[PDB]
Enzyme design. Structure first.
Site, mmCIF file in Angstrom:
data_model
loop_
_atom_site.group_PDB
_atom_site.id
_atom_site.type_symbol
_atom_site.label_atom_id
_atom_site.label_comp_id
_atom_site.label_asym_id
_atom_site.label_seq_id
_atom_site.Cartn_x
_atom_site.Cartn_y
_atom_site.Cartn_z
ATOM 1 N N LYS A 165 -0.031 3.465 -2.838
ATOM 2 C CA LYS A 165 -1.224 4.342 -2.783
ATOM 3 C C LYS A 165 -0.803 5.811 -2.895
ATOM 4 O O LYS A 165 -1.586 6.625 -3.414
ATOM 5 C CB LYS A 165 -2.074 4.065 -1.523
ATOM 6 C CG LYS A 165 -2.747 2.666 -1.573
ATOM 7 C CD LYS A 165 -3.483 2.289 -0.287
ATOM 8 C CE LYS A 165 -4.326 1.037 -0.505
ATOM 9 N NZ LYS A 165 -4.270 0.129 0.686
ATOM 10 N N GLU A 219 -5.892 -3.792 -6.418
ATOM 11 C CA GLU A 219 -6.119 -4.397 -5.094
ATOM 12 C C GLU A 219 -7.136 -5.565 -5.186
ATOM 13 O O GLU A 219 -8.112 -5.464 -5.931
ATOM 14 C CB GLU A 219 -6.690 -3.362 -4.115
ATOM 15 C CG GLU A 219 -5.809 -2.166 -3.899
ATOM 16 C CD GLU A 219 -4.560 -2.499 -3.095
ATOM 17 O OE1 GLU A 219 -3.738 -1.555 -2.862
ATOM 18 O OE2 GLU A 219 -4.371 -3.674 -2.681
ATOM 19 N N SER A 262 0.812 -1.247 0.000
ATOM 20 C CA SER A 262 0.000 0.000 0.000
ATOM 21 C C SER A 262 0.831 1.277 0.000
ATOM 22 O O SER A 262 0.254 2.377 -0.124
ATOM 23 C CB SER A 262 -0.961 0.016 1.185
ATOM 24 O OG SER A 262 -1.948 -0.997 1.062
ATOM 25 N N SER A 319 -5.976 3.484 4.337
ATOM 26 C CA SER A 319 -5.452 2.389 3.529
ATOM 27 C C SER A 319 -6.571 1.542 2.940
ATOM 28 O O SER A 319 -6.424 0.323 2.785
ATOM 29 C CB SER A 319 -4.479 1.526 4.362
ATOM 30 O OG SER A 319 -3.428 1.024 3.536
ATOM 31 N N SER A 327 1.512 -3.472 3.743
ATOM 32 C CA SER A 327 1.870 -4.837 4.162
ATOM 33 C C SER A 327 1.240 -5.815 3.210
ATOM 34 O O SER A 327 0.343 -5.535 2.451
ATOM 35 C CB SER A 327 1.432 -5.153 5.613
ATOM 36 O OG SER A 327 0.035 -5.186 5.721
HETATM 37 O O1 LIG Z 1 -4.694 -6.541 0.904
HETATM 38 C C1 LIG Z 1 -3.868 -6.999 1.708
HETATM 39 N N1 LIG Z 1 -3.392 -6.325 2.781
HETATM 40 C C2 LIG Z 1 -3.735 -4.991 3.087
HETATM 41 C C3 LIG Z 1 -4.962 -4.447 2.752
HETATM 42 C C4 LIG Z 1 -5.186 -3.100 3.055
HETATM 43 C C5 LIG Z 1 -4.225 -2.364 3.723
HETATM 44 C C6 LIG Z 1 -3.030 -2.930 4.099
HETATM 45 C C7 LIG Z 1 -2.079 -2.155 4.780
HETATM 46 N N2 LIG Z 1 -2.116 -0.809 5.056
HETATM 47 N N3 LIG Z 1 -0.976 -0.460 5.745
HETATM 48 N N4 LIG Z 1 -0.170 -1.600 5.862
HETATM 49 N N5 LIG Z 1 -0.912 -2.597 5.229
HETATM 50 C C8 LIG Z 1 -2.773 -4.251 3.754
HETATM 51 C C9 LIG Z 1 -3.364 -8.416 1.435
HETATM 52 C C10 LIG Z 1 -2.650 -9.177 2.392
HETATM 53 C C11 LIG Z 1 -2.192 -10.475 2.107
HETATM 54 C C12 LIG Z 1 -2.390 -10.991 0.838
HETATM 55 C C13 LIG Z 1 -3.077 -10.286 -0.132
HETATM 56 C C14 LIG Z 1 -3.261 -10.896 -1.506
HETATM 57 F F1 LIG Z 1 -2.332 -10.328 -2.317
HETATM 58 F F2 LIG Z 1 -4.472 -10.625 -1.968
HETATM 59 F F3 LIG Z 1 -3.205 -12.222 -1.406
HETATM 60 C C15 LIG Z 1 -3.532 -8.989 0.164
HETATM 61 O O1 LIG Z 2 -6.246 -5.399 6.994
HETATM 62 C C1 LIG Z 2 -5.058 -5.498 6.741
HETATM 63 N N1 LIG Z 2 -4.564 -6.429 5.949
HETATM 64 C C2 LIG Z 2 -5.379 -7.373 5.336
HETATM 65 C C3 LIG Z 2 -6.676 -7.097 4.909
HETATM 66 C C4 LIG Z 2 -7.403 -8.140 4.338
HETATM 67 C C5 LIG Z 2 -6.850 -9.393 4.158
HETATM 68 C C6 LIG Z 2 -5.559 -9.651 4.592
HETATM 69 C C7 LIG Z 2 -5.028 -10.922 4.424
HETATM 70 N N2 LIG Z 2 -5.661 -11.927 3.824
HETATM 71 N N3 LIG Z 2 -4.822 -13.054 3.840
HETATM 72 N N4 LIG Z 2 -3.612 -12.679 4.428
HETATM 73 N N5 LIG Z 2 -3.799 -11.342 4.800
HETATM 74 C C8 LIG Z 2 -4.828 -8.633 5.193
HETATM 75 C C9 LIG Z 2 -4.086 -4.547 7.363
HETATM 76 C C10 LIG Z 2 -2.821 -4.896 7.805
HETATM 77 C C11 LIG Z 2 -1.957 -3.988 8.395
HETATM 78 C C12 LIG Z 2 -2.360 -2.660 8.493
HETATM 79 C C13 LIG Z 2 -3.615 -2.288 8.033
HETATM 80 C C14 LIG Z 2 -4.033 -0.867 8.170
HETATM 81 F F1 LIG Z 2 -4.757 -0.781 9.270
HETATM 82 F F2 LIG Z 2 -4.788 -0.521 7.149
HETATM 83 F F3 LIG Z 2 -3.005 -0.017 8.178
HETATM 84 C C15 LIG Z 2 -4.484 -3.239 7.476
#
Ligand SMILES: O=C(Nc1cccc(-c2nnn[nH]2)c1)c1cccc(C(F)(F)F)c1
Ligand SMILES: O=C(Nc1cccc(-c2nnn[nH]2)c1)c1cccc(C(F)(F)F)c1
Ligand SMILES: O=C(Nc1cccc(-c2nnn[nH]2)c1)c1cccc(C(F)(F)F)c1
Ligand SMILES: O=C(Nc1cccc(-c2nnn[nH]2)c1)c1cccc(C(F)(F)F)c1
Length: 260
Positions: free
Chosen positions: A45, A138, A42, A102, A209
């Site tokens: 973004k 995404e 992200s 995010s 992440s």
């Molecule tokens: O979309 C994912 N993570 C996510 C979503 C929204 C925000 C953040 C985030 N914001 N700040 N740090 N991470 C991470 C995500 C995590 C694992 C695997 C996948 C995937 F690629 F779809 F398999 C997506």
């Molecule tokens: O929600 C988050 N990640 C996310 C969302 C949906 C799916 C997954 C995921 N799916 N499988 N492995 N991770 C991860 C996430 C992680 C760190 C930080 C943030 C945040 F809060 F946006 F900054 C969001």
């Protein structure tokens, strides 16, 4: 010396760490794996919001343009967009949601407004970033598979771009201020780079992440009494289900701060 400290942190972390600092007081850089590719997650973004801000320079009402949010649009993390399903958000609202919360649905609307992930890459190239590439929407742009070139950049390139966007002239003045305002209002960053800085060092940041325990942050920082810094900290691990390590990013930032 700072590189040796970052090496020690990386070795005890189990993962791979990339760091780029630009000190705008003197233009000097500290780099650690600064020319290796990392999945952006992200942190990308920022590029998408900045591209929409650049569009807004030639369309003064663009940021108030409504975008339909449909049930089918929602992806996997939609804390703001879900409130607006069957309604509209403006491009300003989607930019704020993407950057500050995010929101992944919001990011997708940004990408679509730019004509797809390639449009975001085109904007990066236009502002002198030959390294950034956005390949996917995404949520799949966060797969973060080791060795995969998709949706990556290097710490050096991302620092140089963040500097141009937030402190230089890649954007018009209004737009630059709007981007900095948005980053400074981030809700997701207190455990990452900013956890490693003195409390007096004002900052804005964007986290990311993904899979492989990928844990990222990019920041613009105003150290007390000094010219601003730009800092990128990227971290990724060898196993798909690895846990996030925001503390590693904080540790990197602290090393950087103590080395100034
Ligand atoms: O979309 C994912 N993570 C996510 C979503 C929204 C925000 C953040 C985030 N914001 N700040 N740090 N991470 C991470 C995500 C995590 C694992 C695997 C996948 C995937 F690629 F779809 F398999 C997506
Ligand atoms: O929600 C988050 N990640 C996310 C969302 C949906 C799916 C997954 C995921 N799916 N499988 N492995 N991770 C991860 C996430 C992680 C760190 C930080 C943030 C945040 F809060 F946006 F900054 C969001
Ligand atoms: O302004 C820049 N450097 C710099 C550093 C130290 C002092 C000064 C300076 N002092 N007086 N007028 N400029 C400028 C500068 C260099 C490359 C890129 C950027 C940019 F655009 F912000 F990304 C700014
Ligand atoms: O690096 C400097 N300026 C610079 C170089 C390249 C690009 C830019 C720049 N791009 N966009 N806004 N500034 C500035 C710089 C550093 C110390 C002192 C000076 C000065 F003021 F000319 F002596 C300039």
């Amino acid at each position: 010396a700072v590189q040796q400290k970052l090496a020690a942190l990386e070795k005890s972390s189990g993962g791979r760490l990339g760091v780029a600092l630009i000190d705008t007081a003197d233009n000097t850089q500290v780099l650690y794996r600064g020319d290796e590719r990392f999945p952006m997650c992200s942190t990308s973004k920022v590029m998408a919001a900045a591209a929409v801000l650049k569009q807004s320079e030639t369309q003064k009402q663009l940021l108030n343009q409504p975008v339909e949010i449909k049930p089918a649009d929602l992806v996997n993390y939609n804390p703001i967009a879900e409130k607006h399903v069957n309604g509209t958000m403006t491009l300003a609202e989607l930019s704020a949601a993407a950057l500050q919360y995010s929101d992944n649905t919001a990011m997708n609307k940004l990408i679509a407004q730019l004509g797809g992930p390639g449009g975001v890459t085109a904007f990066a190239r236009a502002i002198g970033d030959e390294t950034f590439r956005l390949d996917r929407t995404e949520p799949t742009l966060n797969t973060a598979i080791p060795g995969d070139p998709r949706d990556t950049t290097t710490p050096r390139a991302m620092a140089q771009t963040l500097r141009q966007l937030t402190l230089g002239h890649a954007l018009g003045e209004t737009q630059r201020a709007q981007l900095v305002t948005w980053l400074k209002g981030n809700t997701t960053g207190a455990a990452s780079i900013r956890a490693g800085l003195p409390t007096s060092w004002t900052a804005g940041d964007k986290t990311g992440s993904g899979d492989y325990g990928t844990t990222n942050d990019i920041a613009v920082i105003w150290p007390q009494g000094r010219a601003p810094l730009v800092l990128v900290t990227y971290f990724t691990q060898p196993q798909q289900n690895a846990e996030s390590r925001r503390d590693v990013l904080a540790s990197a930032a602290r090393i950087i701060a103590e080395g100034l």
